RNA sequence: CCUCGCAAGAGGUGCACAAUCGACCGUGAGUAAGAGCAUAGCUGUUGGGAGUUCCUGCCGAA
């Protein structure tokens with residue numbers, strides 16, 4: 001009642017809880033996912049081979 | 053008692069890595085052949 | 100211009116991390132474009148009202164495209180009829196959010212759009228008028 | 232009334248409460264009143280079951296509980312109903328509502344799962360697909376059952392191709408499905424003959440047409456279309472099964 | 475005249491001639507953070523530690539096998 | 553929320569963090585396998601985690617999972633490593649089956665070092681008994 | 683992101699009654715805004 | 728961004744904005760689908776009586 005829920009007024013005049021810019025806190029879950037890795041090109045070595 | 057099962061994400065990763073490695077090997081063979089032909093062309097141009 | 104957002108917002112940094120990874124690992128230039136947009140300052144992120152979304156969809160063949168606004172979307176009471184679309188943007192005002200939900204549309208964060216369209220397929224980026 | 236209580240007990244911190252909720256669910260599910268209920272009770276029950284999975288501790292208990300969720304689909308079968316008539320039974324309609332609620336809840340909660348928490352749910356989706364297809368096998372793949380299951384369950388969201396459905400679920404099922412039918416059907420030379428014959432019996436050739444339609448459409452995402460086209464059409468078992 | 479060109483190599487920076495980076499230690503709990511990094515790091519007991527605590531720190535350090543840079547300080551002179 | 557937690561802990565006050573003269577940071581967390589404040593290191597940062605830690609003569613293994621993130625009292629599952637070093641490594645690998653290589657490698661190294669420390673403190677405190 | 687929390691009796695025994703989480707706990711955790719507001723308000727005293 | 732194309736390209740569609748072309752309102756700041764307000768930081772100018780400058784680095788007229 002003091003702060004409000006999804007369907008309940010916050011009891012503060014003209015107040016709503018803030019929205020999230022990013023829907024998911026964990027970026028590792030999103031970056032891994034299942035579809036992105038399908039969309040992603042093959043990876044590099046992650047430790048560049050020295051040339052010349 | 054019961055055996056543990058492989059994670060369902062690691063299996064997808066293994067499949068993807070295997071396919072990528074096969075693709076890279078094919079590209080490597082083609083690149084080797086192209087390099088030989090390129091060296092022949094360079095020799096002709098130099099002469 | 101910038102190499103990273105001057106803002107110290109955690110969630111904006113997380114989105115920037117995701118999109119720079121995609122731009123690095125995706126051939127599509129959409130990820131690069133949105134990555135560069137995420138760095139912009141407030142003056143360089145003019146609000147794109149629901150009005151502009153309606154015009155952008157009225158353009159032929161763009162009715163079913165996912166409109167993208169790297170920034171905030173503001174309501175415009177000037178309109179009565181608004182078509183259904185799945186707008187994506189950083190922020191949505193309460194009026195704009197209500198208008199989108201009412202007309203059968205829906206609003207998503209840019210991470211949800213990345214999950215939807217890692218290559219930005221069928222996307223339509225919009226930018227507000229930066230007159231001043 | 233009872234359905235809300237089951238949903239609450241499943242979403243209980245105490246492990247004993249969570250287990251007892253599921254045990255009582257096994258009895259409650261095989262009842263007329265549940266069949267009479269609307270799809271919203273199904274969806275609430277699936278939310279409760281999803282959170283029951285959410286609290287599972289360790290990989291071996293996770294396997295056991297995924298098996299239990301498969302058994303839940305396995306319960307809604309009557310041997311008599313298959314024999315009486317080709318036309319679908321109301322029990323079967325209740326089962327279709329059950330699957331519908333499962334996939335709706337999984338689509339809803341797919342995005343909120345943690346990275347480490349996603350692995351268990353992939354196994355859950357695997358076992359749920361196994362149990363749903365085992366139901367068709369126990370019913371002997373009635374045409375009415377197959378049609379309504381495809382249209383109401385799989386076409387609704389798993390294979391809809393709609394933007395709303397998270398694309399990860401389509402990639403996941405297309406990875407699952409090939410191995411799942413082979414699981415149903417069960418040296419390699421004779422084993423392949425047995426698999427081929429039993430596959431000829433099965434209607435999987437009907438199912439693949441949905442992925443064909445998905446690949447056909449332009450509006451669907453190129454990532455999903457490309458992965459399905461590469462994984463399935465290039466598959467060897469389809470050639471072995473003349474599909 | 476000091477300037478950046480005189481800067482030392484990173485791989486050799488902050489290294490004593492013994493080859494151990496010095497890490498300040500106040501109590502046994504802070505000593506135990508250096509349990510395995512015996513090769514990379516050596517402990518240094520803080521100036522404000524009492525004599526009674528220093529012997530305990532030295533005993534625990536010997537048990538862990540972590541080099542102490544300044545033993546026999548306030549237990550011996552110089 | 554692990555990424556948010558880690559970012560706050562990184563760019564704000566990780567109370568167990570100690571800033572060494574080199575600039576490297578050390579988390580004081582007793583459960584920490586690698587005493588260096590990093591993404592993979594803070595038990596606080598990561599939901600999935602493991603450690604070898606000595607209790608009395610025993611060298612127990614502590615397990616941490618996202619499932620028990622709530623109820624922190626019962627969060628850490630306690631497993632007795634066998635005194636036989638080979639059996640201990642086998643048990644660690646078994647329990648850490650299908651587990652990210654970082655924690656497994658660090659856990660094995662920590663077990664080796666703790667075993668050596670137990671041996672050498674037995675050495676320093678050899679007595680006439682037996 | 684649990685559904686509910688279990689009340690606990692004063693003696694310690696867990697209570698059967700459970701309460702759903704409020705929506706506040708699923709809110710943005712922003713160190714920067716908290717830090718700025720905290721500095722501004724702590725300057726007052 | 729979509730299709731075709733291995734690719735170059737063929738197109739299709741078009742944010743911001745520009746280019747000219749005009750209509751209307753009243754010849755522009757134009758309209759024909761607005762962005763501002765508030766707070767904090769840094770900081771330019773005008774001001775009201777109104778010698779050198781801890782260490783290092785960086786960018787750089789004439």
Ligand SMILES: [Mg+2]
Pocket residue numbers: 045046047
């Ligand atoms: Mg590597």
Ligand SMILES: [Mg+2]
Pocket residue numbers: 043065068069
């Ligand atoms: Mg890979």
Ligand SMILES: [Mg+2]
Pocket residue numbers: none
């Ligand atoms: Mg302004």
Ligand SMILES: [Mg+2]
Pocket residue numbers: 158
């Ligand atoms: Mg037009």
Ligand SMILES: [Mg+2]
Pocket residue numbers: 521
């Ligand atoms: Mg002194």
Ligand SMILES: [Zn+2]
Pocket residue numbers: 561566568569579589590594
């Ligand atoms: Zn730390």
